[PDB]
Design a protein around this motif. Structure first.
Motif, PDB file in Angstrom:
ATOM      1  N   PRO A 168      68.712  35.362 -80.147  1.00  0.00           N
ATOM      2  CA  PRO A 168      69.147  36.082 -78.943  1.00  0.00           C
ATOM      3  C   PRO A 168      70.017  37.307 -79.246  1.00  0.00           C
ATOM      4  CG  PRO A 168      70.335  34.007 -79.199  1.00  0.00           C
ATOM      5  CD  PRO A 168      69.120  33.943 -80.083  1.00  0.00           C
ATOM      6  N   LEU A 169      70.939  37.165 -80.197  1.00  0.00           N
ATOM      7  CA  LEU A 169      71.819  38.257 -80.547  1.00  0.00           C
ATOM      8  C   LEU A 169      71.024  39.447 -81.088  1.00  0.00           C
ATOM      9  CD1 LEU A 169      74.402  35.947 -82.296  1.00  0.00           C
ATOM     10  CD2 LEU A 169      74.749  37.154 -80.126  1.00  0.00           C
ATOM     11  N   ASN A 170      69.995  39.166 -81.886  1.00  0.00           N
ATOM     12  CA  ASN A 170      69.164  40.227 -82.435  1.00  0.00           C
ATOM     13  C   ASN A 170      68.275  40.788 -81.324  1.00  0.00           C
ATOM     14  OD1 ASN A 170      67.862  41.794 -84.670  1.00  0.00           O
ATOM     15  ND2 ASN A 170      66.106  40.509 -84.128  1.00  0.00           N
ATOM     16  N   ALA A 171      67.713  39.899 -80.509  1.00  0.00           N
ATOM     17  CA  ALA A 171      66.856  40.313 -79.409  1.00  0.00           C
ATOM     18  C   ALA A 171      67.621  41.300 -78.517  1.00  0.00           C
ATOM     19  CB  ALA A 171      66.410  39.086 -78.608  1.00  0.00           C
ATOM     20  N   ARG A 172      68.911  41.041 -78.330  1.00  0.00           N
ATOM     21  CA  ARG A 172      69.725  41.910 -77.500  1.00  0.00           C
ATOM     22  C   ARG A 172      69.719  43.344 -77.988  1.00  0.00           C
ATOM     23  NH1 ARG A 172      75.048  43.327 -78.126  1.00  0.00           N
ATOM     24  NH2 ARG A 172      75.984  44.361 -76.313  1.00  0.00           N
ATOM     25  N   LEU A 173      69.850  43.529 -79.297  1.00  0.00           N
ATOM     26  CA  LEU A 173      69.833  44.883 -79.846  1.00  0.00           C
ATOM     27  C   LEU A 173      68.475  45.549 -79.687  1.00  0.00           C
ATOM     28  CD1 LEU A 173      72.070  45.615 -82.853  1.00  0.00           C
ATOM     29  CD2 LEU A 173      72.623  45.072 -80.491  1.00  0.00           C
ATOM     30  N   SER A 174      67.407  44.770 -79.747  1.00  0.00           N
ATOM     31  CA  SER A 174      66.081  45.343 -79.566  1.00  0.00           C
ATOM     32  C   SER A 174      65.970  45.902 -78.150  1.00  0.00           C
ATOM     33  CB  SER A 174      64.998  44.288 -79.786  1.00  0.00           C
ATOM     34  OG  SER A 174      65.065  43.796 -81.109  1.00  0.00           O
ATOM     35  N   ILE A 180      71.306  49.654 -68.314  1.00  0.00           N
ATOM     36  CA  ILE A 180      71.013  48.294 -68.714  1.00  0.00           C
ATOM     37  C   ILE A 180      72.124  47.703 -69.596  1.00  0.00           C
ATOM     38  CG2 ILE A 180      69.443  46.804 -69.935  1.00  0.00           C
ATOM     39  CD1 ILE A 180      67.219  48.532 -69.245  1.00  0.00           C
ATOM     40  N   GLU A 181      72.603  46.548 -69.196  1.00  0.00           N
ATOM     41  CA  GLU A 181      73.620  45.776 -69.917  1.00  0.00           C
ATOM     42  C   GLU A 181      72.948  44.469 -70.315  1.00  0.00           C
ATOM     43  OE1 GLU A 181      76.720  44.886 -67.129  1.00  0.00           O
ATOM     44  OE2 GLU A 181      77.887  46.695 -67.586  1.00  0.00           O
ATOM     45  N   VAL A 182      73.250  43.977 -71.513  1.00  0.00           N
ATOM     46  CA  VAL A 182      72.650  42.713 -71.971  1.00  0.00           C
ATOM     47  C   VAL A 182      73.766  41.789 -72.429  1.00  0.00           C
ATOM     48  CG1 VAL A 182      70.992  41.631 -73.488  1.00  0.00           C
ATOM     49  CG2 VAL A 182      70.571  43.933 -72.729  1.00  0.00           C
ATOM     50  N   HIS A 183      73.725  40.546 -71.970  1.00  0.00           N
ATOM     51  CA  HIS A 183      74.755  39.573 -72.331  1.00  0.00           C
ATOM     52  C   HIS A 183      74.108  38.336 -72.924  1.00  0.00           C
ATOM     53  CE1 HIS A 183      77.687  42.003 -70.031  1.00  0.00           C
ATOM     54  NE2 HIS A 183      76.678  42.226 -69.239  1.00  0.00           N
ATOM     55  N   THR A 184      74.838  37.656 -73.794  1.00  0.00           N
ATOM     56  CA  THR A 184      74.301  36.466 -74.450  1.00  0.00           C
ATOM     57  C   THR A 184      75.146  35.208 -74.315  1.00  0.00           C
ATOM     58  OG1 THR A 184      75.278  37.287 -76.516  1.00  0.00           O
ATOM     59  CG2 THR A 184      72.927  37.710 -76.171  1.00  0.00           C
ATOM     60  N   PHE A 185      74.471  34.067 -74.392  1.00  0.00           N
ATOM     61  CA  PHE A 185      75.105  32.761 -74.314  1.00  0.00           C
ATOM     62  C   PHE A 185      74.302  31.898 -75.283  1.00  0.00           C
ATOM     63  CE2 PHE A 185      77.601  33.559 -70.469  1.00  0.00           C
ATOM     64  CZ  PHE A 185      76.910  34.611 -69.882  1.00  0.00           C
ATOM     65  N   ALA A 186      74.577  32.094 -76.571  1.00  0.00           N
ATOM     66  CA  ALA A 186      73.875  31.383 -77.637  1.00  0.00           C
ATOM     67  C   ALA A 186      73.969  29.866 -77.541  1.00  0.00           C
ATOM     68  CB  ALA A 186      74.363  31.862 -79.004  1.00  0.00           C
ATOM     69  N   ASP A 187      75.169  29.332 -77.311  1.00  0.00           N
ATOM     70  CA  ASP A 187      75.336  27.860 -77.233  1.00  0.00           C
ATOM     71  C   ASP A 187      75.507  27.240 -75.843  1.00  0.00           C
ATOM     72  OD1 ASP A 187      76.084  25.722 -79.741  1.00  0.00           O
ATOM     73  OD2 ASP A 187      76.911  25.133 -77.799  1.00  0.00           O
ATOM     74  N   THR A 188      74.472  26.548 -75.378  1.00  0.00           N
ATOM     75  CA  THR A 188      74.498  25.820 -74.082  1.00  0.00           C
ATOM     76  C   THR A 188      73.694  24.544 -74.323  1.00  0.00           C
ATOM     77  OG1 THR A 188      72.360  26.524 -73.025  1.00  0.00           O
ATOM     78  CG2 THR A 188      74.420  27.512 -72.230  1.00  0.00           C
ATOM     79  N   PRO A 189      73.876  23.546 -73.449  1.00  0.00           N
ATOM     80  CA  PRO A 189      73.172  22.285 -73.586  1.00  0.00           C
ATOM     81  C   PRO A 189      71.686  22.574 -73.479  1.00  0.00           C
ATOM     82  CG  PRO A 189      75.177  21.941 -72.368  1.00  0.00           C
ATOM     83  CD  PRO A 189      75.006  23.420 -72.511  1.00  0.00           C
ATOM     84  N   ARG A 190      71.336  23.633 -72.754  1.00  0.00           N
ATOM     85  CA  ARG A 190      69.916  23.965 -72.560  1.00  0.00           C
ATOM     86  C   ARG A 190      69.324  24.897 -73.611  1.00  0.00           C
ATOM     87  NH1 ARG A 190      66.318  20.906 -70.351  1.00  0.00           N
ATOM     88  NH2 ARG A 190      67.836  19.206 -70.666  1.00  0.00           N
ATOM     89  N   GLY A 191      70.132  25.248 -74.603  1.00  0.00           N
ATOM     90  CA  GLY A 191      69.669  26.141 -75.647  1.00  0.00           C
ATOM     91  C   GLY A 191      70.331  27.501 -75.574  1.00  0.00           C
ATOM     92  N   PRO A 192      69.877  28.466 -76.394  1.00  0.00           N
ATOM     93  CA  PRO A 192      70.438  29.830 -76.407  1.00  0.00           C
ATOM     94  C   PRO A 192      69.826  30.681 -75.273  1.00  0.00           C
ATOM     95  CG  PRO A 192      68.703  29.694 -77.994  1.00  0.00           C
ATOM     96  CD  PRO A 192      68.935  28.269 -77.515  1.00  0.00           C
ATOM     97  N   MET A 193      70.669  31.490 -74.616  1.00  0.00           N
ATOM     98  CA  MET A 193      70.221  32.353 -73.515  1.00  0.00           C
ATOM     99  C   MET A 193      70.620  33.829 -73.648  1.00  0.00           C
ATOM    100  SD  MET A 193      70.993  29.879 -70.267  1.00  0.00           S
ATOM    101  CE  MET A 193      70.048  28.314 -69.988  1.00  0.00           C
ATOM    102  N   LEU A 194      69.685  34.725 -73.276  1.00  0.00           N
ATOM    103  CA  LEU A 194      69.968  36.143 -73.311  1.00  0.00           C
ATOM    104  C   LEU A 194      69.830  36.581 -71.866  1.00  0.00           C
ATOM    105  CD1 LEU A 194      70.380  38.758 -74.841  1.00  0.00           C
ATOM    106  CD2 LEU A 194      67.943  38.903 -75.193  1.00  0.00           C
ATOM    107  N   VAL A 195      70.757  37.419 -71.343  1.00  0.00           N
ATOM    108  CA  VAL A 195      70.598  37.830 -69.949  1.00  0.00           C
ATOM    109  C   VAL A 195      70.758  39.341 -69.817  1.00  0.00           C
ATOM    110  CG1 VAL A 195      71.453  37.608 -67.602  1.00  0.00           C
ATOM    111  CG2 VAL A 195      71.571  35.653 -69.160  1.00  0.00           C
ATOM    112  N   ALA A 196      69.705  40.012 -69.349  1.00  0.00           N
ATOM    113  CA  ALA A 196      69.765  41.456 -69.160  1.00  0.00           C
ATOM    114  C   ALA A 196      70.211  41.747 -67.744  1.00  0.00           C
ATOM    115  CB  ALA A 196      68.396  42.082 -69.426  1.00  0.00           C
TER     116      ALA A 196
END
Lengths: 375, 372
Positions: free
Chosen positions: A122-128, A157-173
């Motif tokens: 997700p962190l890398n995806a964010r930069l893409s 466009i702003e992109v935020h991340t939440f790598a650790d959650t019970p449901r897995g890693p999340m990327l939010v644009a």
């Protein structure tokens, strides 16, 4: 042009209507809308929501004395609770003596959330995504050229991340969109769906939710008031003492969430009625208002109160205010259209500015009352 | 009562009304209230708020299929936004298959705040109040003897302190009052004014504010629902995938305030309309709802969603729900009185339980839509 409405509080509703009819130069047909019940046709009503079996009425009133950036305005309000209209009008009156209310607002900016899951990076995806920001912004902007010409559209466009959650890693644009005079939901949701596919391609994950965020913290409205000690003089208290008490009252709300919830409720007692009157979504305004009040990780007061260098009482109200001049019931409801006619608003942000001034005045009245009451 | 309302969505408003009329056994007078405009007399309206110049209407609808603790209920709603009524009705329908909604609530308890200032010994003053807690509770319980014989009244006192505040030291007492079927504001405020003098005497300081707190966290309403995978598969999605997605959606709301605000808004899309329909204060319900959503310091989701042991989707909604069957517009508005008639509620807490079930169903629909 003159919102002082003398004796208005004692004029019959008919007399009050006539009055409002004249100073605004209202059309005959327009006065008919509030003079006889049923302004909302069943077939208009039946088309608004589902399983309709009738209509439900609430009093339609007008607060007096308001003055926005030097110009007088009459404010329609729809609510069932007493004292609100009076308190708002009275504080607006005290406000005129010191210049009335001074307002301002940001551009009508709304967020559209695009949640992406299934990416291991997700962190890398964010930069893409950020890399191709302008490509994403353009795709979104070729889906509504009228708005762009009207002076709006996706601006960033702003992109935020939440790598650790019970449901897995999340990327939010977050698509940042200027919606001009609309509240924004569909303009924003629409664009979110248009970029979702491209985002999937860039990240390799899959879009889950595509929808506007009601936390409209990029669409703020601002209002200021000033009251002098002379104006706050009551039978038993000095205008100064009262100012000091209001300050103790604000402090109490700034620290105690139990007081803050109540304090902010009062603010919404002033705002929500203007929202309903103009056919806008009051749940949207409420959610954004309260979520914003606890942005400091502590649920606090939306307004601020201080004593300035002159000893004068000065209050502020800055908050998100997503509202529209077009859209839904704002257009289809004859009274909503009339409310806008009564307000004289030319842009959605102008309506927003009026909203916070009324909310600020309502908070003021509430505190003045509690502060001036004896034991 | 059977809340199916088959084909209801397509009947004309008149047909729908007649239908609600038979089904409930309403009188011609009662049906007349929704069949012609103007149910709210101007002189009633004019006495409700100030500077009145007319009335403003919003659609009055009824959501179908709801089932509370095994019994069917028809739910009136007043709002301007589309999809709300349909979504609520559809999820209520899916809910019936697994028992409908299961609810419960606490006693109708409200706080009255009594702020005290002008003391250099707040912490000590607090113990003096607790020392005479019972003397304070009894004084308050006389200002309203009727409330007490009805089964309500002041039941306790909590005292909180704020030692350093840019305005000085503050002591805040909380009168805990059971208001039976009222929302409670005036019942509570009155008692607060009745004890303020005694509190001044005990602490030596002076009472500033005396007013109810809208953060009604002692008056909670609870609702549960269960949906099976079978019920949730579309032409394009498998039920379990859908349950899993809803779970991803909930998780997203639990961590991101930008999603939570939107998530909770949907819950209020279901609740506020029932509040207006019954003449209750929707600002009070809104403030208590959102303030409660960030009690932990992080603004999150009021509802919860999980997959239970059999793979079934289970959601809950616990939140403050201060509403009344008496008080203000709940009595003076002919339609508010009619809504209560349609609901069949006998206590304010019963109405509160219906409120969270509708709010829970609304949240469900919104999430089923987006993951679908």
């Amino acid at each position: 042009l003159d919102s002082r409405l003398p004796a208005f509080r004692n004029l019959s509703p008919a007399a009050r209507l006539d009055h409002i009819g004249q100073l605004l130069g209202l059309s005959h047909d327009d006065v008919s809308l509030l003079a006889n019940a049923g302004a909302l046709p069943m077939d208009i009503a039946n088309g608004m929501i589902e399983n309709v079996i009738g209509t439900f009425e609430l009093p339609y009133a007008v607060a007096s004395n308001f003055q926005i950036n030097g110009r007088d305005v009459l404010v329609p309000l729809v609510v069932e609770e007493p004292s609100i209209v009076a308190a708002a009008s009275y504080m607006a009156k005290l406000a005129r003596a010191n210049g009335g209310f001074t307002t301002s607002s940001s551009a009508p900016l709304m967020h559209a959330q695009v949640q992406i899951v299934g990416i291991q990076d997700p962190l890398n995806a964010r930069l893409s995504l950020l890399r191709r920001k302008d490509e994403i912004i353009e795709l979104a902007n070729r889906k509504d050229q009228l708005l762009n010409s009207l002076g709006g559209g996706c601006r960033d466009i702003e992109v935020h991340t939440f790598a650790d959650t019970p449901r897995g890693p999340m990327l939010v644009a977050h698509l940042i969109v200027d919606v001009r005079d609309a509240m924004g939901a569909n303009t924003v949701n629409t664009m979110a769906e248009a970029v979702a596919p491209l985002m999937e391609a860039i990240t390799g994950g899959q879009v889950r939710l595509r929808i506007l965020s009601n936390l409209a913290d990029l669409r703020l409205a601002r209002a200021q008031v000033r009251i002098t000690p002379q104006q706050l003089e009551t039978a038993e208290f000095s205008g100064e003492a009262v100012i000091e008490g209001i300050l103790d009252a604000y402090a109490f709300a700034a620290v105690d969430p139990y007081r803050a919830a109540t304090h902010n409720k009062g603010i919404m007692n002033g705002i929500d009625p203007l929202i309903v009157a103009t056919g806008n979504d009051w749940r949207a305004v409420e959610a954004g208002a309260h979520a914003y009040a606890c942005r400091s990780g502590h649920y606090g007061s939306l307004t601020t109160w201080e004593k300035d260098n002159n000893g004068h009482l000065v209050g502020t109200l800055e908050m998100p205010m997503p509202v529209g001049l077009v859209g839904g019931a704002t257009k289809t409801h004859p009274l909503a259209q009339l409310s806008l006619r009564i307000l004289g608003v030319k842009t959605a942000q102008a309506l927003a500015e009026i909203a916070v001034a009324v909310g600020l005045a309502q908070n003021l009245g509430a505190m003045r009352a509690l502060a001036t009451e004896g034991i």
